[PDB]
Design a protein around this nucleic acid. Structure first.
Ligand code: K
Ligand code: K
Ligand code: K
Ligand code: K
Ligand code: K
Ligand code: MG
Ligand code: MG
Ligand code: MG
Ligand code: MG
Ligand code: MG
Ligand code: MG
Ligand code: MG
Ligand code: MG
Ligand code: MG
Ligand code: MG
Ligand code: MG
Ligand code: MG
Ligand code: MG
Ligand code: MG
Ligand code: MG
Ligand code: MG
Ligand code: MG
Ligand code: MG
Ligand code: MG
Ligand code: MG
Ligand code: MG
Ligand code: MG
Ligand code: MG
Ligand code: MG
Ligand code: MG
Ligand code: MG
Ligand code: MG
Ligand code: MG
Ligand code: ZN
Lengths: 207, 53, 125, 122, 114
RNA sequence: CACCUCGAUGUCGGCUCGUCGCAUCCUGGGGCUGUAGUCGGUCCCAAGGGUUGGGCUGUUCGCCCAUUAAAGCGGCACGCGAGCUGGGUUCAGAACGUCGUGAGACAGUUCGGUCCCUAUCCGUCGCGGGCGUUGGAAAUUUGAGAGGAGCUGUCCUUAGUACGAGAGGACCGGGAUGGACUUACCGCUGGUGUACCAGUUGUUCUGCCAAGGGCAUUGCUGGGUAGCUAUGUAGGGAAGGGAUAAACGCUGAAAGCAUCUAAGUGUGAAGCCCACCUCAAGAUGAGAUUUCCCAUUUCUUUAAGAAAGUAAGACCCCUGAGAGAUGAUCAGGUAGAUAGGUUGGAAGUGGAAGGCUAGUGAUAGUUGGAGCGGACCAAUACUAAUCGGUCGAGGACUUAACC
RNA sequence: GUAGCGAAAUUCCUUGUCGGGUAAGUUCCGACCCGCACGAAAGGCGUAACGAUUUGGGCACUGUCUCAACGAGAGACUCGG
RNA sequence: CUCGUUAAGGAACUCGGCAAAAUGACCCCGUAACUUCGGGAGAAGGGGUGCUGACUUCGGUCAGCCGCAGUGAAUAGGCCC
């Protein structure tokens, strides 16, 4: 497998070797850097730790500089691990350019969703509003909590709370174009996240 | 609805843990030495960042 | 976005206009946090017009200002009655002709007694 | 976005003049239709000396809609009325001459005779 | 957005004239059957342009056979070979959505010659 | 039967939310057939998911219309009224029929008729603080374990092949596209957009003209930025394993044969454990890795001692949003673009004011896609994030190769 | 028990039968009359106008609904009393 | 909770069009069955309404102008069977 991680920019609207539009999301992938390589004999599993976005040193800290110093790079902001990849191909200090991907390949995209805040059950779970006339006093509410006999409410009864902030994949997307000069990927379709938010791109698990 | 049961002194005092108030941002004014909230004019001398006000 | 100040749209517009007029008059004012943080941008966008000086800007500012009386800078008896508009266009534009912004500063002060309202002083220069 | 109890004009000489959607076909809980979607309907207003007459239950095809159609290239068609064509079990029409324009979306759904009989196909 | 413009600059197009809402325009819209490619001329009045850069779309209204038709296109398609302006109408608006309710002699735009 | 409930027991139906069982409606597997093929009938296994919208009636039911792959049966106080309705229930009014000598009643019907509660505890959904995890801290993580999702039609091909005298009409396999459901998102379509723009009515105000302000639901009307968003866009439930159900067995004996079983061994389902996604080390059984600070002062004591300044670091405080009820999270704090403003632009509005020309004037044209321009973009330290303070380690014992 | 009315504010059986209206109508309209249990001042049959009367149908209209979405303001929310 | 907008549809909601929406002022035209000849009836249904000059014999009228829209906002019937 493979992958990178990058920053969401925004949406566009693109023509692909024909007049057929493709809506597109822009991911800026300033070249990721390997920092650590984990193996079974020391760490329990094969994996590779990666950093994306350079901090200022005043924002970083000593024990992070010490972790970056092996690869001989600058303090990174977002740090993540990639699993189920070849370790003989990758080394500490290696820079992962966007050239790794080929326009057209199928891809999976993780991101943290836009915070919607403390929301009701209707918006949070698609529940239906009660009637708004005919004497109804039941408009935006989640309904009964359950039967009588348990004398208790069953779990996963869906209610109001924080909507958003969750980690979400989108599978079976497609890479539309690459710009290594600009370090940009164009991905067919919407993806989870606010702008200036982290995204992880990976080769598809299903494909 | 109605309590159905009086709460105990214990259960009261266990609610009252986080009802306490904190007071914060106090430092000393470099001019007069008396204490002021940070990012606030010293009410005694009026100075802020070494300039009368 | 922008603040609301517990007032309706018209009410907050009128309160901003009144406070900005009073501020242009007095060159210094006591307010709360939020009112000040909005009046900041407001007065600075008025002094921009003051610097531009054209009649177009004069009318864009008369759209906003309450036509209060800033000062009777008298010489003989009562002649020189000066409005806040005249003050904006003949004292303050010439004052901040050279700054590229930053026509006010905010100073946090004692909270108010009756509310614990955090109080603030805005001042030119 | 054509629903049950939604009324439609008729775009052929079959005999009908106004139509009311009984149900949409396709699936179990389809609550909506657009161009190329077949309809089951009544006849609320018919031409007097018409084959198709008042009260008859009949299938139909939506040919133009206000909530219109979309193309791959972002080109979208829309209309100022919702109209339909009455058909038999086969995709062929009951009448013989279609009025007004028609969307291109029907050629994929194999209403080719209607596409031909229509004067303008957008 | 700067990056967006930099990316989309190449697929932006320059054969477009600076037309408006209110003005009549013919679109040489090419349609694709897989076996053939046919251009057809869709004439109409422009009710709106809207968008920025490459998200710019415009709609064109027509009255074919008593049925008002309304066709939106992206401005920067390769599947629109030419956009011929043929009248420069005068309106006091940008969105001519009032035309949907009118029919004919009231839906007529006043030409300028400029 | 009257054991519980008459110092309250709320009565049916519907709505919102669902959950469970399997005696399975569909999908899935299989045996038998009076199963030629398509359709089927019946029985065994299977509860993973799904199991429609309307007319009539207060109705459950039921009838009908029209679809569906299918329109399951039941339980959960005939689920759910401190969650909703109150149509139906003879509360009080009135009336028809009928009964009664009558006051009144129903062996019937009809019109109308007050549904109180600020959630203490558990419970549920979410968010924090404290402490712990045996020196203090910053990050990344395995993953026990939990949850979520689990559906399905139509068409094409194989093939008008097999089947069948014909009619009609296939398994198995590979493709195309939908439905409902759902995860995310706003570039497209549209919606909203109450500190955007323009037009416009009345009155009043800025002394008057002009230009503008206020009030009239944002005065009304026409648009519309960001953001929020579905009806809009993209995606999803894909292949595949392992062990099994029913069934099929292979070899094989008890029982010289036979036999799927007793040992031995194997096919075998939408089901189970994985595989897909998410949460997850409070998993007190508190894990693992990388990196950083180091092993100071005094007093008391052989004390895993006490306070009292600190390192790494964190916090207070402040500017704020991609976050947000408050906490929190995140971005920053002049080692600076965090916000405001300024300058540029963009969207959006749609041709500003002042002039001039023409015109009787209304008004039109030109200066000039002008001017305005909230939250959008990029620069720019002009203002504000000043000064500063607080907390926070020096690391127990036993035994293992010197451990 | 007459005229007149009649599944009716009266008809249980009964969602009576037939017709109309609807795709579909236990309601409604019109006829029939096996009037459980109409009927003549406890008035019968009819009746223009009238009715915050009851009932059903239609047109327009719309967030009633499909299926919810956004905005504003008061409260809820944080702080002070 | 009180308000405001809404794509497409438009009562499919519901016990039931409850509530909301729509109509709403003035001028002119025109107005059915039925009828106790009085009414029904503001039936219904339509059109017009702003500004500036000429024109009347003072209201009509003509021409031109502007807007999506002229009782431009507020106040004023939903109708029919
Ligand atoms: K219990
Ligand atoms: K009782
Ligand atoms: K209950
Ligand atoms: K009868
Ligand atoms: K009777
Ligand atoms: Mg309410
Ligand atoms: Mg107002
Ligand atoms: Mg009791
Ligand atoms: Mg069974
Ligand atoms: Mg219903
Ligand atoms: Mg009906
Ligand atoms: Mg019950
Ligand atoms: Mg009742
Ligand atoms: Mg009574
Ligand atoms: Mg008697
Ligand atoms: Mg009443
Ligand atoms: Mg409550
Ligand atoms: Mg969604
Ligand atoms: Mg959008
Ligand atoms: Mg946008
Ligand atoms: Mg004036
Ligand atoms: Mg006033
Ligand atoms: Mg007043
Ligand atoms: Mg097996
Ligand atoms: Mg009957
Ligand atoms: Mg008698
Ligand atoms: Mg009697
Ligand atoms: Mg008598
Ligand atoms: Mg009487
Ligand atoms: Mg609507
Ligand atoms: Mg209904
Ligand atoms: Mg009403
Ligand atoms: Mg008005
Ligand atoms: Zn001081």
């Amino acid at each position: 497998t493979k992958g990178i991680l990058g920053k969401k920019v925004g949406m566009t609207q693109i023509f692909t070797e024909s007049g057929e539009l493709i809506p597109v999301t822009v991911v800026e992938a300033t070249p990721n850097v390997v920092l650590q390589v984990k193996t079974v004999e020391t760490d329990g599993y094969e994996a590779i730790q990666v950093g994306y976005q350079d901090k200022r040193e005043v924002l970083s800290n000593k024990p992070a500089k010490g972790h970056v110093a092996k690869a001989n790079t600058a303090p990174k902001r977002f740090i993540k691990e990639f699993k189920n990849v070849e370790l003989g191909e990758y080394e500490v200090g290696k820079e992962i350019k966007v050239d790794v991907f080929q326009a057209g390949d199928v891809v999976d995209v993780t991101g943290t969703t836009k915070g919607k805040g403390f929301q009701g059950a209707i918006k949070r779970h698609g529940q239906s509003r009660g009637p708004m006339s005919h004497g109804s006093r039941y408009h935006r509410r989640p309904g009964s909590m359950g039967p009588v006999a348990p004398n208790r409410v069953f779990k996963n009864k869906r209610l109001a709370g924080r909507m958003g902030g969750d980690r979400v994949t989108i599978q079976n997307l497609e890479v539309v174009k690459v710009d290594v000069e600009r370090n940009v990927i164009l991905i067919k379709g919407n993806i989870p996240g606010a702008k200036k938010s982290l995204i992880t791109i990976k080769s598809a698990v299903k494909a | 609805a109605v309590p159905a049961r009086r709460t105990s002194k214990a259960k009261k005092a266990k609610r009252r843990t986080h009802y306490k108030l904190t007071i914060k941002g106090l430092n000393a004014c470099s001019n007069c030495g008396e204490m002021k909230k940070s990012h606030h004019v010293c009410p005694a001398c009026g100075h802020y960042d070494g300039k009368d006000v | 976005s922008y603040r609301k100040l517990g007032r309706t749209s018209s009410q907050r517009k009128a309160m901003l206009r009144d406070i900005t007029t009073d501020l242009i008059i007095n060159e210094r004012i006591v307010t709360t946090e939020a009112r000040a943080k909005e009046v900041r941008s407001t007065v600075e966008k008025m002094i921009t017009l003051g610097k531009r000086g054209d009649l177009h800007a004069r009318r864009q500012a008369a759209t906003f200002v309450r036509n209060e009386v800033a000062s009777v800078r008298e010489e003989d008896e009562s002649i020189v009655v000066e409005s806040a508009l005249q003050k904006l266009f003949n004292d303050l534009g010439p004052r901040f002709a050279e700054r590229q912004g930053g026509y006010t500063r905010i100073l946090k002060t004692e909270p108010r007694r009756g509310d614990a309202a955090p109080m603030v002083v805005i001042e030119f220069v | 976005m054509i629903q049950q109890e939604s009324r439609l004009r008729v775009a052929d000489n079959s005999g009908a003049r106004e139509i009311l959607t009984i149900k949409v076909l396709g699936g179990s809980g389809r609550k909506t239709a657009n161009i190329g979607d077949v309809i089951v309907a009544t006849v609320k207003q018919a031409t007097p000396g018409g084959v198709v007459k008042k009260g008859e239950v009949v299938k139909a095809v939506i040919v133009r809609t206000k909530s219109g159609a979309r193309r791959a290239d972002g080109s979208y068609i829309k209309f100022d009325e919702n109209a339909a064509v009455i058909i038999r079990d086969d995709k062929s029409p009951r009448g013989t001459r279609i009025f007004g324009p028609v969307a291109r979306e029907l050629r994929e759904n194999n209403f080719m005779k209607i596409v031909s009989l229509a004067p303008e196909v957008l | 957005n700067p990056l967006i413009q930099e990316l989309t600059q190449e697929q932006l197009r320059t054969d477009i004239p600076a037309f408006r809402p209110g003005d009549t325009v013919r679109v040489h819209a090419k349609v694709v059957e897989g076996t053939r490619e046919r251009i057809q001329l869709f004439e109409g009045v422009v009710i709106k342009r809207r968008g920025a850069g490459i998200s710019e779309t415009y709609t064109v209204r027509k009255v074919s056979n008593g049925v008002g038709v309304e066709r939106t296109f992206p401005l920067h398609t390769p599947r629109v070979a030419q956009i011929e302006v043929v009248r420069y109408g005068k309106v006091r608006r940008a969105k001519l959505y009032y035309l949907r309710a009118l029919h004919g002699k009231a839906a007529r735009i006043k030409e300028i010659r400029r």
